[PDB]
Design a protein around this ligand. Structure first.
Ligand SMILES: [Cl-]
Lengths: 386, 384, 386, 386, 386
């Protein structure tokens, strides 16, 4: 029968052997790198599995990310590589694994969690719901070329510039109160900057990173504070583009390029969705940034069989960009939500769509205006996939 | 030797000839129809053109629209079918025509205007800027069928049900303080439901209209106030034997929280532009974020429409806004027509600054402006 | 059993019947149009068919064209709509038909003939060989929109401007010593010009005609002497180009648009070939323009079973831009060639290619060069399909 | 601030670093091959660069080619691998580089230069203009298989046959009076025949080389004197094609295969263009072969600020297949050209097109006709890309 | 001069070079597996070739399969890897090789031969004809998942199970009187399951093997005796199908999935054909199973210049599932067959089709009912391609 387990650096082959049944083998190249990058998860309590008898039959790992929510950085458990063997169909193997993944994360002090679901039913059942997007837009390289900004000094960047990149990014997001985006460890970011096939460029108030990994020029991140720098960095890109007509870029759907280029992005675009769950509701609220003008005094009834600790009646108290979540004895027409409703609300989804989706019931409409302006802001997005 | 003009009914054939230079001829069917509603624009003085001597060399028409903004209805000139004859390249014809269009829209009391731009340059120079999106998502019909809802009563609907649809929509959008959506004249909703190519269904608290498209199904509009009704109408669209269902909707629509399979990663994302014609009127009509408050000065520089140029005070409180003349002095937010239209449409000041659409002013009070103008990103359902 | 016949008015529904079995039925207005055109061919002895008993079983028509050679207009028979009932496969109907066609063409005085072959085998046996090209190139609409020539007066053209179109092009081709191009009757030009699907524009020293029939913008023809008019006419096309990235165009590869435009035409091009036959070789030599400065006195041995009238040893005298092909009494080594080699040579194919292809034998290789320069010049092409 | 430099053996990794940022990383196999082929350029003063401090920021190499023009071999400088670091956009680095390359090419006594232009604008400013084409045609494999010549002997060929290939080609191009085709050093030819993935076959009066490197069969070059040998070599290719419908082929636009094959080549073809420049016009003229029978005596006013040594008024004297350009003290109206006009004229672009595209002005039109005669012949082409 | 040989191990590199001219180079990883698998063919005398003096010029190899016909196993020579150098075109090297192949097969005790034909012409001339099919059908992954049978025990399988797989399939095919299917040797089957790229599962009365080698999920073989097992196995396929919408399967058109699954297979399916040849008619007949309760006594006249040994009049006797072919000296109108007709009949093609195709002629059309019934049953098919 079924046993939760900590994957050893040994049994990585077993994990790959399971994974293969659903995805086929890796190239011997991509395989050597998969294994090299797994060891860190293994020796930091961040690679879990399910064993049946003496046989690894399921596995999942946990990134220790941080994530911007309203301009603050909240520790989050990014779940990836969930695999279950096909001959263990419908024996609730995935649920045991995921129940272990969840408490491992709660134990390590991650008040929230996120993933890209391969299917949605299994994750909705454990209390996840959609929280944001990843957008990919396509541009014409010639357009990026004629943006100008030739006076701006742009140089090539390497791993010695990681401190500088974090600084620029953390300044930008804190200003705009961004939500959804990943914070990568300064360590992990230097590696990215050392990658022979990663091209990174630094101006005084911005940077750009792009790659050629698929026959196509792709921009992974652009950050720029002034118009000048923005035009220089995009022109550096359009200039690296050789003769290719088009260039892809991961960016917010509010990004200033759209306001700068002469041809609109191509109508064909990529829209992905990622999911969110709260693991420690008070803590998540504590770390969150709230819209600076927000007053809100609201009670809410929480039903979370999966994390009973945060189940019950609570009062939300927010003002001055900060929030607190505390138990409550009150007795009124309160708001009722489950883990999904609770995660979706944290993610700034409008209460109208949540009532229509049945993810929340009850309470007065006065409260709906409040939480909409409190949890409101720019729509959550990220640039990464995992 | 060029002059702005009101298109008459007999000049329509000439407009179609100009149109053919850029688009090719209309099929016999689609021509007959084009002329049908062209007549209406002519009659309501919403069909402008440019003549050189005694022959048409450009035209454009003005939809008598209304557009949602913060859960309130605002009169807006939707500009469509802009065409210029090719031999008049480089003589500024398009620009002369559009200034004709701005003035007529202004004179008919529409404080804002919107359009889908074929090219960005001419329209940005007339003061328009991107203001929202139209999104198309693609679902598998099987996934909508699984939604269920079959316990909810749903009957076939038609033209006679137009009034009731309008109640249902208005309730939905007021409740969600929606932004960006068209309100069409009830004659066009009339001919919409009348069309046998369109399939309408109605429940106690929702409706849906859809049709065939290249062998797939397309949802024009779905409104549902409750979960069971949404399940019921999506599952209706998805009933059958038609694998793919396309839908026009916001990225925050509740479908995405119900359907067990995510919409296709490949999506269509188009943009439409906006311009203010009478800023104070536009402000007065707009709905503002509940519990938002702002009291700041603005410097508007708009050579295209000088009446809204100069310094203004903006007052927002209790969901209502007001724009009044200011003679004060000192550092302030400066906006051209483009920055102003994008701000009205909820675009965050950071972007406007990085794009050079806005400069100056204490960057700390950007916060109050973002908040007052914020809310659900503006989108719409239709193309025009 | 089968016999050659002149197609009559009341036999046109039958031709259409045969047509539909190979190509499918026409639309209903296409028929009304197809019929009206045909009637002209019937009343001028230019629509031949083959009947079996009382049934029409094949048919073909003869355009009364002219074609440019070395800057001169040469009368020519353009063969169109060769159609055969599928039931009458392998019975020689095609050959019988074509020989009738060839005969009707000499009888009407056309020294040369041309067509677009659906298959090559039958035509090669009857004496046609490839003689020229039709090129379609693809440009960016944006490149055209910015060529300039802003002051050049350019107006809508229509059926009244037909003679002026033929006038501009006449001086253009006489100048360049052009070869290959079609000379349509003024009547046909006028119809082309007045067609509401076609969009013509006129200036003091040029014109352009284009259309949107594909769904793509297609340039049928552009002519312009001076630089400014060339830039202006292309700029007109660029403005009719809507949001279409791409515009196609039928033109020479010597066309100056390649030297004017900023981005090279697309690599993906359309190259079609048309075939040629001499029917009265002394007459075709007399009518041809010959390269300026070019001179040669050589003998030729022609073997043409298909048209015995032009078999035998001739002598061609060439100087001052004219030629003449007289019966020759000489004897010795002499370049011999058949109908195919005779036509390709007239078309200015290199003798080296003709020898290797085996369409020419014997003769001193010394006087090969003499022939090359006589028939040399800009390579033959046309803009039309038929 | 930047400096023109000769790339040294130590700087070769630097060059690949620049190359990577606009073509993508080189796979370990291809990189060693890049290095082996780069040392020759380095140690013969044919690898230029631009340096900023001690960073390489741009590079280009010069092939020691000869190019056919009118039957004779003219030494030429082929420019390849032009690369400029993305951050150095809008700073004239490309021009700093190319001027060095032009200067170096002139010192080494190559009177002409050619390249394939990624973009037209910068090279046109440096005085290059389109001179010829590369064509690729598509054929049905079955049509080739049956061309015959069953008795012709054909064997595998290899490096040791290099000299024999060069002999056979040289014979052909001399008789045909060819223009545009490359002459490779025998070393490079032997390297080409040596490659295990190029398939080469030798006959008594011809050869063919083809390959499978793209999922399609592609003919690089086929040379054949007689009809039987042309048929044999094409049928050899046809047996190579296996079950594939189509075979692609780089050929002259006048290649005999079009007269031989049963189904016409596909309509869809590839048409690319290369550019040319004169570096030393009197030498370039003296090396050129000229049209047989052609005579000309005509003055010529050249304006080339980019190479002042060839500016001023010259006399073109053309007779007996030989030309000479001498300084002329005459006065009066005369054809004027800058570098682009001069190169395109030398390539035999018709005067008409030159005038319409504004590259040539002035002059009696008497000059035009004799000049079109003087530079005419088969249209310039080549089989190779570089 | 052309000579047939047995390929030795030291000639395998020469074989690959011949293969290369027709299929392009083998990826270095694919090349070593090829040489690996080639040696077993060499050491068992089942790799033939043709040499020209010293050089290898063509090759082919022979699988020692068995093939089901009417529920009995018949030894059969499966031909694969036919290659001829492209320069030896038109010299009949293919025929000389194949005649070699046939003779070796006949020597090794194999009464029949099968192959997938690249072209039909050469194999028909040698006596082969289409005898069966291989079908691929496409199903919704979700429909496979919801088939149920989760109570049924299903484990992962390895080479250990090889004996058992042969056992399960053996009894299934004897039951159904199967024709067309392959019998791999047990060793080839253990190596099959050992392959880390194949995923195999085993139940008490059935198994399934699938893989991901093309980017898609593909079922190589499924077998299942009970309904619950058929259900569980398809469910295992469904589970391992990841997020992929559709799965492909190789099976009979009469397979039981079509009766179980709720959405019909896609209209779009793959249908390949394989050919058959009799090498020794009395042996092949004696090994074949015949239809239950069919009887026949009838004379046949075989005309096989390829294999003279089997020409002449024969008597066919069929009773109680067994048939025997004896020589006859009777006279009188009888059914006449060449090698192709003889194969098609054996394969179960109906006599009416053989008559319209002209593969068969003569004889009382009445007795055709006997023959059709005797050779009849479920249509021959195969899961494997070789
Ligand atoms: Cl093989």
């Amino acid at each position: 029968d079924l046993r939760l387990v900590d994957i050893t650096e040994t049994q990585l082959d077993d994990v790959l052997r399971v994974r293969a049944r659903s995805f086929g083998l890796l190239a011997a190249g991509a395989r050597e790198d998969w294994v090299r990058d797994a060891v860190e998860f293994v020796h930091d309590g961040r690679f879990l599995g399910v064993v049946s008898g003496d046989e690894v039959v399921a596995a999942a790992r946990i990134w220790d990310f941080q994530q911007w929510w309203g301009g603050r950085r909240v520790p989050m458990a990014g779940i990836a590589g969930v695999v279950v063997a096909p001959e263990y169909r419908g024996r609730g193997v995935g649920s045991l694994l995921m129940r272990g993944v969840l408490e491992r994360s709660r134990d390590k002090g991650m008040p929230i969690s996120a993933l890209y679901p391969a299917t949605t039913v299994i994750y909705r059942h454990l209390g996840y719901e959609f929280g944001g997007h990843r957008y990919r837009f396509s541009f014409q390289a010639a357009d990026l070329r004629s943006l100008g900004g030739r006076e701006v000094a742009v140089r090539r960047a390497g791993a010695k510039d990681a401190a500088r990149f974090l600084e620029l990014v953390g300044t930008a997001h804190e200003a705009s109160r961004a939500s959804g985006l990943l914070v990568w460890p300064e360590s992990k970011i230097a590696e990215w900057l050392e990658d022979e096939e990663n091209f990174a460029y630094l101006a005084e108030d911005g940077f750009v990173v792009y790659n050629w990994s698929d026959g196509d020029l792709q921009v992974d991140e652009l950050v720029a504070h002034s118009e000048a720098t923005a035009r220089a960095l995009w022109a550096t890109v359009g200039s690296g583009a050789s003769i290719a007509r088009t260039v892809h870029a991961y960016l917010s759907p509010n990004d200033p390029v759209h306001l700068l280029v002469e041809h609109e992005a191509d109508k064909q675009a990529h829209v992905q969705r990622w999911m969110l769950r709260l693991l420690d509701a008070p803590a998540a609220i504590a770390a969150r940034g709230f819209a600076p003008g927000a007053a809100a005094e609201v009670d809410l009834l929480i039903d979370d069989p999966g994390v009973p600790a945060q189940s019950g009646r609570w009062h939300l108290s927010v003002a001055d960009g900060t929030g607190e979540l505390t138990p409550s004895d009150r007795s009124g027409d309160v708001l009722q939500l489950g883990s999904r409703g609770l995660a979706a609300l944290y993610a700034g989804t409008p209460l109208a769509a949540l009532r229509t989706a049945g993810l929340v019931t009850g309470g007065p409409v006065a409260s709906d205006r409040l939480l909409d302006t409190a949890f409101g802001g720019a729509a959550p997005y990220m640039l990464d996939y995992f």
